[PDB]
């Protein structure tokens, strides 16, 4: 039925300071601009089926999904960096640009008969809700992420007049915002769970929200469709896929209004977090730890789209940091009061002199020579010049992968992992990792390095040789 993670073998995809992750690299390559160029490149996997608990985990590993494509950015080599951000309704610093946004929303959707019922000065949920229930002109409908003409036509308009994007077809809209790697129950649900989500303003703290999975939230004003939020509703909260709005309603700040509404929906449905990616008392994911760190101390760096690795700097590390497989993607945080202050140690691992590289290459040599897995030395010289790189922040470091081979842990996949060579009959159990051919071991390594050993134990890997 669902707990199986059914995925195509992962790979580097084409395109699904300011451009350098570390000042190390920028300093030695700008005055020398013309000789290099920098990829735009995702790493990821086409997912045929996954449940939403697993995607919740992948989310908190810093993955996002575009349609059925589960992916992340190489935070070291790519021209731009993606940050996974989570916020809760209560950590939202209610600035006034937000308070103004909410306030004009309220007056536009309400009448003149009534006005804010002694609501608190920054209770954005209370104003948002009670304005909406005392409104005759504005509402929203949560519905299944399914194609329709009205939705596509608004999408096209938003794409053209807000992104100068004339590359639209229904097929392309379908693939991006209606195709999902989830099963039919998570997509279509039941009338009763749709009816409860659409009554989220009437939900109280006892209640547990029943619909989990992808949704389209349609905004209607005076019977006209003016925005669509595409969102994944997960056990821990809401992950934001995309937001479409009509250019005509630009002076509504529908971008900001949607985010607050999403958070008010988080609160009233007794869910926990709102996940932005796509970039306050927010928290940003350190992917080298797979934990969150409070945002404001290191806005110093997302400001400049820069790669950061939180550390204490008691020594200068000599290896990429150790990821605990039970702990990855669980959204743990760092400790609150540390005797040390946290420094960003990314240059000592991943910069020009960085330790990660020869440690990777020494392991690739043992990976190939001792276990017959085709890894080879990369980046000995710089990182700017096939497949997933040996060193990628947030992927399992090779020295650690190598310990799975050498300890025998790798054989734990024997009897749990399945392989689907798509030109053969069909699925076959993994019976002897070491007796598999090299390009199969490599794929298994890649899934391990990317989605983690636990998830790989419930994986079915689709591949075609040659």
């Amino acid at each position: 039925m669902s707990d199986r993670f059914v995925i195509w073998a992962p790979s580097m995809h084409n395109e699904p300071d300011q451009l350098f992750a570390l000042d190390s690299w920028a300093h030695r390559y700008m005055n020398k601009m013309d000789v290099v160029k920098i990829e735009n490149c995702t790493i990821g996997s086409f997912v045929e089926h996954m449940d939403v608990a697993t995607y919740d985990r992948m989310c908190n590993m810093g993955f996002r999904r575009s349609g059925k494509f589960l992916y992340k950015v190489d935070p070291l080599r790519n021209c731009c960096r993606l940050y996974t951000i989570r916020t809760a309704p209560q950590e939202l610093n209610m600035t006034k640009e937000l308070k103004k946004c909410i306030s004009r929303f309220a007056t536009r959707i309400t009448s003149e008969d009534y006005c804010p019922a002694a609501v608190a000065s920054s209770d954005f949920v209370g104003k948002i809700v009670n304005a909406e229930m005392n409104s005759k002109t504005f509402y929203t409908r949560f519905e299944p992420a399914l194609y329709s003409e009205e939705k596509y036509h608004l999408f096209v308009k938003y794409q053209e007049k807000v992104h100068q994007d004339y590359n639209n077809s229904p097929k392309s809209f379908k693939r991006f915002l209606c195709d999902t790697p989830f099963g039919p129950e998570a997509v279509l649900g039941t009338q009763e769970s749709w009816e409860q989500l659409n009554n989220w303003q009437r939900m109280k703290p006892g209640e547990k929200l029943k619909h989990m999975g992808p949704v389209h939230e349609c905004y209607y004003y005076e019977g006209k469709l003016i925005a669509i939020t595409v969102s994944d509703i997960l056990p821990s909260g809401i992950s934001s896929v995309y937001f479409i709005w009509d250019p005509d309603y630009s002076k509504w700040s529908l971008g900001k209004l949607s985010a607050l509404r999403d958070l008010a929906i988080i609160q009233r449905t007794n869910l926990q977090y709102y996940y932005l990616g796509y970039y306050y008392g927010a928290e940003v994911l350190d992917v080298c730890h797979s934990k969150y760190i409070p945002l404001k101390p290191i806005q110093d760096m997302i400001s400049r789209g820069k790669l950061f690795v939180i550390g204490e700097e008691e020594t200068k590390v000599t290896k990429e940091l150790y990821l605990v497989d039970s702990e990855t993607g669980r959204g743990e945080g760092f400790p609150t009061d540390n005797v040390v202050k946290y420094k960003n140690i990314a240059e000592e691992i991943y910069g020009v002199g960085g330790c990660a590289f020869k440690s990777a290459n020494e392991s690739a040599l043992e990976l190939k020579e001792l276990y017959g897995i085709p890894y080879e030395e990369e980046d000995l010289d710089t990182i700017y010049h096939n497949g997933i790189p040996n060193v990628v922040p947030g992927l399992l470091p090779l020295w650690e992968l190598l310990d799975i081979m050498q300890s025998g842990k790798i054989t734990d996949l024997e009897g749990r992992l399945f392989l689907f060579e798509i030109e053969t009959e069909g699925i076959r159990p993994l019976i002897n990792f070491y007796s598999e051919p090299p390009n199969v071991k490599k794929r298994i390594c890649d899934v391990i390095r990317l989605f983690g050993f636990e998830t790989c134990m419930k994986a079915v890997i689709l591949y075609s040789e040659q």
Side-chain angles (χ1 to χ4, degrees):
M1 296 167 32
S2 209
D3 309 39
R4 276 295 173 166
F5 180 58
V6 184
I7 54 136
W8 282 93
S11 79
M12 286 271 290
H13 280 79
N14 280 1
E15 274 144 321
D17 50 88
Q18 329 197 357
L19 318 91
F20 298 86
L22 303 179
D23 308 334
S24 319
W25 296 110
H27 166 82
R28 96 158 208 186
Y29 269 124
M30 261 166 156
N31 289 337
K32 189 142 114 190
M33 270 280 89
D34 54 318
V35 77
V36 82
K37 200 173 122 179
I38 309 178
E39 37 172 75
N40 207 344
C41 261
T42 42
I43 306 184
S45 206
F46 204 76
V47 183
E48 282 303 331
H49 173 104
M50 81 187 310
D51 58 34
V52 307
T54 300
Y55 176 71
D56 199 331
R57 217 197 157 152
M58 291 323 181
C59 194
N60 283 280
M61 283 202 202
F63 290 96
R64 319 233 51 78
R65 97 193 164 74
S66 186
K68 272 152 69 144
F69 186 53
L70 180 59
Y71 73 98
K72 76 194 341 181
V73 281
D74 171 337
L76 169 62
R77 284 190 203 66
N78 198 69
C79 68
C80 74
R81 280 124 284 290
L82 173 76
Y83 301 86
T84 287
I85 290 270
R86 61 155 189 213
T87 41
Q90 308 76 357
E91 52 196 344
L92 171 71
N93 173 248
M94 260 304 261
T95 88
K96 201 190 303 194
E97 62 157 38
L98 320 193
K99 184 185 193 301
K100 320 191 193 144
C101 174
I102 302 284
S103 312
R104 304 312 160 103
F105 170 52
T107 88
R108 183 81 215 214
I109 61 151
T110 59
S111 81
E112 293 177 350
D113 308 21
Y114 330 92
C115 267
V119 54
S121 297
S122 168
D123 182 27
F124 65 104
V125 177
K127 293 179 179 179
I128 272 175
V129 168
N130 262 76
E132 275 194 21
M133 274 173 331
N134 292 287
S135 178
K136 323 183 179 152
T137 37
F138 178 96
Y139 68 97
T140 68
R141 210 193 294 156
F142 285 85
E143 45 177 53
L146 292 181
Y147 182 88
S148 90
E149 224 77 90
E150 189 189 23
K151 273 188 278 170
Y152 178 62
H153 288 306
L154 170 65
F155 174 82
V156 168
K157 195 200 167 166
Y158 163 85
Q159 278 310 106
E160 300 171 341
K161 286 192 152 191
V162 172
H163 295 342
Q164 291 68 59
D165 196 17
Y166 288 77
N167 258 281
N168 314 283
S169 69
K171 177 197 215 183
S172 99
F173 167 77
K174 218 267 177 285
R175 287 228 269 254
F176 177 42
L177 302 178
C178 318
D179 286 351
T180 83
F182 311 118
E185 178 74 8
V187 170
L188 316 170
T190 38
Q191 194 173 46
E192 304 75 38
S193 56
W194 285 107
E195 223 73 26
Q196 169 212 52
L197 170 62
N198 280 296
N199 262 263
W200 64 265
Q201 299 99 308
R202 206 209 88 64
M203 265 184 79
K204 44 172 41 164
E207 299 198 31
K208 189 185 147 230
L209 169 85
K210 312 184 251 263
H211 187 275
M212 299 275 127
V215 300
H216 291 172
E217 171 165 37
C218 300
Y219 286 41
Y220 293 87
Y221 186 71
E222 269 151 39
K224 185 141 212 217
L225 175 81
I226 61 148
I228 306 163
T229 318
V230 196
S231 297
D232 291 323
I233 301 165
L234 317 172
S236 68
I238 302 188
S239 147
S240 180
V241 177
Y242 206 63
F243 180 63
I244 294 133
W245 51 278
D246 180 331
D248 293 341
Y249 297 69
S250 87
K251 314 203 221 313
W252 273 52
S253 312
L254 288 151
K256 307 159 204 318
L257 179 61
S258 70
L260 302 163
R261 285 189 79 265
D262 269 355
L263 281 169
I265 292 176
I266 303 263
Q267 169 145 298
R268 285 272 192 287
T269 51
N270 312 311
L271 289 156
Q272 197 169 351
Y273 290 122
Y274 180 53
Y275 298 95
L276 268 305
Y278 176 77
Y279 220 141
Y280 316 111
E283 297 161 295
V284 59
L285 186 55
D286 189 323
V287 303
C288 296
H289 294 260
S290 207
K291 312 175 170 191
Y292 286 88
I293 182 78
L295 175 72
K296 281 227 144 193
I298 60 100
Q299 60 165 43
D300 295 71
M301 275 167 271
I302 300 146
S303 40
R304 297 214 299 128
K306 287 282 174 281
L307 163 75
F308 74 92
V309 182
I310 293 298
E312 282 166 353
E313 193 79 43
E314 325 213 78
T315 76
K316 83 154 38 164
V317 303
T318 312
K319 283 176 144 66
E320 325 192 35
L321 317 191
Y322 191 92
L323 291 168
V324 174
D325 193 30
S326 40
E327 298 192 5
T328 64
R330 310 299 200 191
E332 281 149 24
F334 298 86
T336 54
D337 289 345
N338 192 31
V339 182
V340 167
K341 293 179 179 179
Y342 289 137
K343 180 180 103 144
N344 166 28
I345 60 179
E347 317 259 19
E348 73 195 35
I349 305 169
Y350 297 119
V352 189
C355 75
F357 299 106
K358 293 179 179 179
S359 175
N361 290 339
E362 303 170 8
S363 316
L365 259 57
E366 296 211 333
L367 279 163
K368 170 182 266 191
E369 300 189 298
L370 257 52
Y371 304 96
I373 315 179
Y375 279 92
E376 195 51 337
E377 274 180 303
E378 302 166 351
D379 301 346
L380 315 89
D381 41 303
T382 59
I383 64 176
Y384 293 105
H385 297 342
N386 316 351
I388 309 179
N390 287 351
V391 163
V392 171
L395 280 46
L396 190 68
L398 289 189
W399 72 273
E400 191 162 334
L401 173 66
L402 185 48
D403 285 339
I404 292 142
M405 302 314 162
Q406 200 251 16
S407 80
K409 191 190 181 184
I410 190 52
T411 61
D412 286 355
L413 295 170
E414 292 171 354
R416 314 197 156 81
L417 174 84
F418 284 75
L419 306 165
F420 193 164
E421 216 285 359
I422 219 76
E423 301 116 328
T424 77
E425 299 299 334
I427 303 177
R428 81 201 173 70
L430 175 90
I431 306 184
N432 189 330
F433 167 83
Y434 300 97
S435 100
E436 291 285 342
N439 286 95
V440 166
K441 305 171 144 162
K442 183 60 159 12
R443 288 169 174 106
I444 304 199
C445 291
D446 282 349
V447 168
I448 290 176
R449 276 195 69 199
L450 195 56
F451 307 113
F453 194 80
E454 289 178 339
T455 308
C456 184
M457 262 180 299
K458 57 200 225 169
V460 181
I461 300 172
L462 278 38
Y463 66 108
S464 34
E465 196 78 73
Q466 323 141 21

